[PDB]
Amino acid sequence: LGPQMEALGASDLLLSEQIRVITEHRYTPDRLQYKEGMKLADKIAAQEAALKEELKVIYGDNVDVKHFQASPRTPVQQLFDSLKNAAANKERAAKEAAAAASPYLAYAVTKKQEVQADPSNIPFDEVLYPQLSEELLELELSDIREDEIALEKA
C-alpha cells in the first residue's frame, strides 16, 4: 500500500502533495487515472494557494496551510482573527485616508474599511447558500461512498 497506509486527509503532507504520491502509487504514467489524478492535484494546489492568500494577512507568511486545510476555521474562530487585527486595520485606514490624493479617495477607504471591519460582514457560503453547501458536502461524500461500494463488492 505504501502511501495508501494513511487516509487522504491524515498525512503530514498537504492534500495536493498527498494526491500526487497516491496517484503515482496507484497508477503508472500512461494511465488515464494518472493524468486525471495529477490534474486533480493541480486544482487542490490552486485551492491551497487561495487558502494561503486569505490567511496570510492574519497568521503571517508561514501560514501552515495544512492545518487550516484539514480543519478549517469556525465562524467563531473567523470572528476572533477579525478582531485580532481590528486595531491595526483601523489605524491603517486612518493613515491611508490621510495619505489619500482626494477627499473622495479618503472617504472611500474609510467606508470600505468600515464595512470590512465588521465580522458580520464576513460572507459565509454556509449561511448565504445553505443548500449549495450541503451539495458541496455530498459532492465529497459521494466520492468517498463510491470507494466504499468498491470495498463492499470485494
Binding site: 487515472q33 486525471e36 489524478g37 490534474k39 486533480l40 486544482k43 459532492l139 466520492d143 463510491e146 461500494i149 468498491a150 463488492k153 470485494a154
Partner: peptide
C-alpha cells in the same frame, strides 16, 4: 472493478 467506478473523474467534476 475500475469499470464499476464513475468514469467521470474528480478532476472533471
Amino acid at each position: 472493478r475500475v469499470l464499476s467506478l464513475p468514469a467521470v473523474s474528480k478532476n472533471q467534476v
